[PDB]
Design a binder for this molecule. Structure first.
Ligand SMILES: *[C@@H]1O[C@H](CO)[C@@H](O[C@@H]2O[C@H](CO)[C@@H](O)[C@H](O)[C@H]2NC(C)=O)[C@H](O)[C@H]1NC(C)=O
Ligand SMILES: *[C@@H]1O[C@H](CO)[C@@H](O[C@@H]2O[C@H](CO)[C@@H](O)[C@H](O)[C@H]2NC(C)=O)[C@H](O)[C@H]1NC(C)=O
Ligand SMILES: *[C@@H]1O[C@H](CO)[C@@H](O[C@@H]2O[C@H](CO)[C@@H](O)[C@H](O)[C@H]2NC(C)=O)[C@H](O)[C@H]1NC(C)=O
Ligand SMILES: *[C@@H]1O[C@H](CO)[C@@H](O)[C@H](O)[C@H]1NC(C)=O
Ligand SMILES: *[C@@H]1O[C@H](CO)[C@@H](O)[C@H](O)[C@H]1NC(C)=O
Ligand SMILES: *[C@@H]1O[C@H](CO)[C@@H](O)[C@H](O)[C@H]1NC(C)=O
Ligand SMILES: *[C@@H]1O[C@H](CO)[C@@H](O)[C@H](O)[C@H]1NC(C)=O
Ligand SMILES: *[C@@H]1O[C@H](CO)[C@@H](O)[C@H](O)[C@H]1NC(C)=O
Ligand SMILES: *[C@@H]1O[C@H](CO)[C@@H](O)[C@H](O)[C@H]1NC(C)=O
Lengths: 322, 172, 322, 172, 322, 172
């Protein structure tokens, strides 16, 4: 019976488990979990910059100036935009918004606008501009989208309406305009006096026209009439020309793109809380140094890479043997 | 495992060896105790640290979903977008899960190899001055003091030194 | 010369081959082929539910009611739709179908319609409705799409035609309408008496109008004239309004979506056989428990995953050594 | 192969061992025959069954082509759709083919390791009561009956028991 | 002290390095670099067939026949098309080109046209055809797109203009036409005498019409007017019919697709050099047998597969040990 | 490495062995020198040649970007196209880089295994007619001439032949 040296290996009281191709549920002495599965359940500032919280307003409601969205008439730079799935306050006067999804996509790379009064309402001296609707009422009286101008007959006449704006603002500018599609001929006559009217818009690259369509339609927000909006990005130093014999809904303002960068519209019913993050998801903010997470695929900011995994655990130590 | 040492001929681990992954337990007239082999532990630590960085770094070139919207007249386009974002998501989940599984397999076998190689290193040094018991231990054909055990643990055992002492023990 | 115990391994008469990264064409004692390469060459019922076999009819021919498609006037729930590459019976009266591919895409998630008589033909009391064409003839006489109504002059007059339908059916409803584009002015006058006519359609969300275009075009099915069809999905409890002074091709029916779920249109020249499957491809039905197949990428039902591979064989046993 | 046993120092397989992947052939005064080692066979079977499930299950998160149509004025969109569906198809074919190749490599080497480890287990038990012939066989320095062979095959060989009998044989 | 045989392995003076999962920067005795990182910096012939070098011309400038593009009036088969990012010579008369990106996509699979005089200018006997503009001037005088015909008043009258062409050419034919949108009413009257004009185009499958839009727009190349171009592919044995009361810009020529195959439009500011390749990138031509390259993703011809990698080196030998 | 031979118990390589990856150095009364083992070298060469072809061939089913253009009113479609082409590019870069890394790991270990197996082959043949020094060398218990060295290098060493000569040397 003599002396001994034995070779052996570490064991401990670790219960950490990993999988292999050949075996599952192996206990190891040390392991590294590389998957973040937690978040704080809140919508936060992103690097100290708050999101734009639309509340009950849609993108269209904001930019057109639905009177229910007046808190948004001037907003500071944002880090992302929060929009509800079905915002209540959009087109108060019913209708449509051409290339709307394209406009929202643009907003993914815009972090601020400066709203510029490009076509001041008071310069429409040959037309009435006080036009509004009970569908956009404020304090019981007819009103209208704050950023738009409904031109109507003045003194029983509607002369050719021409407005133009040269973009001297120093950046590309978003401009929206509309055409009013009445319910009937009496509406057309009372509002515009003219028939067979048109709305023409022209820049160096855009030439888009419209003839209003009179037709009885199902009532929405009380009206069978509609307003159809369109938009363009006016390049620096380019001019936009509006020309109409009736039915033009003119912009008073343009939105100069004043800051660009990676942003996004987050779909959420929630509200901004007093918290800070580098990584925001629609479910809540992530604070981790782990390389992967499984929280949500639609994240904004400096985030880990998303995977569908329930677990990602790397063995680092050896098989833990009793 | 692949190399037959861990949960193999060395049947279990040592709770009493807290300072390393692999090492020694000695027993002599002066007493007994555990000691980690620092060299092999460090070499494995370096490899494992490299492994984890590699697995992470290769999956930093990963797809990100971008939020886009589509009209009720753009359902094919919407579906294409969804199939694409989901498709990449599935590919990257697959890459991550597979990489972790395959590399976990290799990590356990790496440790097994490191134990076997350490054992073999000591074996090939002690030669016939010891009996191989078959359990990870070598029983000496001579008294082996603390300084003697210390020589084995750092590969300075003098076999040419104990050569004659052991053969007499081994034969008598 | 003494006793022996030897350690060894199994060998057999297996000729099963596998590949590795280091070696190809290795014989192994046991292997598992995980790739299905066979099918029954037939189009079958899918879980006991037969497909809708259009035969020589296109989707448009079916839904408009081309008289050559009369067997399809009422069809039961289906599991997939079989359509030929170039069906003969589509628009018998030549023309076009706006957003047709979008309509076909909708059908991928629809498994049944209930055809509802939304605008019964007899209620057009101020217009002629018996209008047809030799291009859609039946038994040698002019006829017309069974589901549509060609309104024409009655008593040498064409009053404003207005029809409306409130979708009380309990599901979303597909509705198609058209506008007739004549070859010449004499055709316009003989059919409608009016000039500068229009067709307007309006729901809560859709406002789409048209002015017919008179122009000489190459003859198709004998005609230089055309009919241009459009469609919409009318939401539950929404109303559709049609208004026209000429050239309207009105729907008589709507197609209520009565069953939804995963379906699809399979392009095939073949015919349904009396067989049953859980997995249908355009080439034939698959019956397997194997996880992969290489039969065709376009499958319907509960199928294995498709790969381009010619072989997928996993070694399970060891190298088979003589 | 990687572990040097299969088609290695054990030069060929046994048609005569039909009841397992690995095992024994013994030869003594009472006769000769084959017997599978049930323990190592079962452990390999369990691993292999796990492997196949893993390879299948990780590729259940696979892309599916959906049938869509496009107008003659939507050729770019049609091409995008086609490039996408083909692209994923190529990725998944690659994943499947590679996984099968890499894992086939590992399966053959796993079996090789299992044979080597079984051999080593018996070797480390018999010690110098046998000669290692170099061909997978051990030749006994004593008569080893059926009960004696049975002890080796389940790891209950009594070396302390045959110790003296064999040394005399080994030396005389 | 006795004889010895030792087992060992090769070492050499290789400094070739490779990476593994477990270790980086390992020196090996032999290695195989599988990544091509070099190119010749030139645009070349592709298998002896030169590209079509547009120079300062755009695709539109070429096909319409902008007078600055006269070198391109007849061009031989090409292997790829070279176009600048912002070619100077496109629509000399300002306007737009409908479905332009679709047209460019078509060109990816076209390697030659035969320009066919489908509607010879001299057959417009009831209209003036010598119409041009200072915006497309040649040697100080007004001129016009070489492939197009600007029909104007003859003898103070503009009768209905009708032209038709049956595609007997033996292949599908690309045909372009336009509509002129004036700046004002005096321009419309001086050019066409008629008002409320239209341009109609019809084939067996296409029915596309237009009413010119008169409107003041920002000046481009000196003009507030515009020309809006459209195109179609006319099938073999199909007929195209043009009909107009004013504002038609007629094609004189069609482009018969005379060779098909994989091609492409390469965006480049560079010029063709006297060199030959099997693989062309926008940065330069690749000549390699290596399976991967990292030069540019947009390649034409028989090329290696592109990856973003900075290095791909496979160990073939063993660890090189001092 | 995994098998413990290369930069392991065989501590370094041989600049003097220029004609193969693995082999011998012998030393006797007649002299000394290097010789590659042709059989094991060729078998490894064949495997390595197969490996490189495999890695290349499996990534010939790779995505290609096609040049398309989009209007200023098709930004979502443009972004979808870009995300798709970039997405596949990232997937294929990942596949290529990972495959090369994983297979480089396996290539170094393959060579290590081949050296260990060659060593073991010679060991199992010489048996106790030699001493295992622990450094890759075997020292003979007899004079082993050039013809004798040549028999070992091609596996025709006659142990039954030198059996008695060596035991006397080994014991005396
Ligand atoms: C619009 O205003 C601009 C700025 O005053 C006018 O002038 C230039 O427009 C060019 C167009 O590329 C710019 O590059 C220059 O920055 C401008 N500077 C000058 C010299 O004026 C432009 O003339 C105006 N447009 C019209 C139609 O008058
Ligand atoms: C159309 O018919 C419906 C059902 O009769 C009418 O009424 C409601 O419409 C709302 C719309 O959201 C539904 O939610 C209800 O189910 C309906 N029920 C009631 C109380 O009638 C609707 O008024 C009709 N439309 C018109 C224009 O009269
Ligand atoms: C256009 O010219 C063609 C060729 O002369 C005319 O005739 C046939 O058109 C069909 C259409 O599918 C082709 O398949 C044949 O090759 C043509 N050959 C014959 C018999 O003519 C066609 O009639 C002409 N179109 C018109 C309107 O007259
Ligand atoms: C893993 O093993 C543990 C015991 O070691 C036991 O709870 C169970 O069998 C396994 N657990 C899971 C989640 O599969
Ligand atoms: C080996 O260990 C002993 C401890 O007894 C020590 O004296 C000696 O310096 C060590 N040798 C090396 C290589 O450090
Ligand atoms: C595989 O090997 C067999 C003989 O073992 C022989 O037919 C041929 O060389 C190989 N077959 C194929 C299909 O490569
Ligand atoms: C080992 O095998 C022998 C057969 O001779 C048997 O008697 C004994 O019980 C076995 N031991 C174990 C561990 O089952
Ligand atoms: C790789 O090793 C070399 C020396 O072997 C040295 O230059 C450096 O540490 C490493 N080089 C790089 C590029 O990492
Ligand atoms: C082995 O090598 C010797 C060289 O001395 C040679 O004579 C003999 O033929 C070789 N045997 C084989 C198997 O070729």
């Amino acid at each position: 019976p003599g002396d001994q040296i034995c070779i052996g290996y570490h064991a401990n009281n670790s219960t950490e488990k990993v999988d292999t191709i050949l075996e599952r549920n192996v206990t190891v002495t040390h392991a590294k979990d590389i998957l973040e599965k937690t978040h704080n359940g809140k919508l936060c500032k992103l690097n100290g910059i708050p999101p734009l919280e639309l509340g009950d307003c849609s993108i269209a409601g904001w930019l057109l100036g639905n009177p229910e969205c007046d808190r948004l008439l001037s907003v500071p730079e944002w880090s992302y935009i929060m929009e509800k799935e079905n915002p209540r306050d959009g087109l108060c006067y019913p209708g449509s918004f051409n290339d709307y999804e394209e406009l929202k996509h643009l907003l993914s790379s815009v972090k601020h606008f400066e709203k510029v009064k490009i076509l001041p309402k008071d310069r429409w001296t040959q037309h009435t501009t006080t036009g509004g609707s009970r569908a956009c009422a404020v304090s019981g009286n007819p009103s209208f989208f704050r950023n738009m101008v409904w031109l109507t007959e003045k003194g029983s006449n509607y002369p050719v309406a021409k407005g133009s704006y040269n973009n001297t603002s120093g950046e590309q500018m978003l401009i929206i305009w509309g055409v009013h599609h009445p319910n009937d001929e009496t509406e057309q006559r009372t509002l515009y006096q003219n028939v067979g009217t048109y709305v023409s818009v022209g820049t160096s690259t855009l030439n888009k026209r419209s003839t209003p369509e009179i037709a009885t339609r199902p009532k929405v927000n009380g009206l069978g009439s509609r307003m159809e909006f369109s938009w363009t990005l006016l390049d620096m130093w380019d001019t936009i020309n509006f020309e109409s014999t009736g039915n033009l809904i003119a912009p008073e303002y343009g939105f100069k793109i004043s800051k660009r960068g990676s942003s996004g519209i987050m779909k959420t019913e929630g509200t901004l809380e007093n918290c800070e993050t580098k990584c925001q998801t629609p479910l809540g903010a992530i604070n981790t140094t782990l390389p992967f997470h499984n929280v949500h695929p639609l994240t904004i900011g400096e985030c880990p890479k998303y995977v569908k995994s329930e677990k990602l655990v790397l063995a680092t130590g050896l098989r833990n043997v009793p | 495992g692949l190399f037959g040492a861990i949960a193999g001929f060395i049947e279990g681990g040592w709770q009493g060896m807290v300072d390393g992954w692999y090492g020694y337990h000695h027993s002599n007239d002066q007493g007994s105790g555990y000691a980690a082999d620092k060299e092999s532990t460090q070499k494995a630590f370096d490899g494992i640290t490299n492994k984890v960085n590699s697995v992470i770094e290769k999956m930093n070139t990963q797809f990100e979903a971008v939020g886009k919207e589509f009209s009720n007249l753009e359902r094919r386009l919407e579906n294409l977008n969804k199939k694409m974002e989901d498709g990449f998501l599935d590919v990257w989940t697959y890459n991550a899960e597979l990489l972790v599984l395959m590399e976990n397999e290799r990590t356990l076998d790496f440790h097994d190899s490191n134990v076997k190689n350490l054992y073999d290193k000591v074996r090939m040094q002690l030669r016939d001055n010891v009996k191989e018991l078959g359990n990870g231990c070598f029983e000496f054909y001579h008294k082996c003091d603390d300084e003697c055990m210390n020589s084995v643990k750092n590969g300075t055992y003098d076999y040419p030194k104990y050569e004659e002492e052991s053969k007499l023990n081994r034969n008598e």
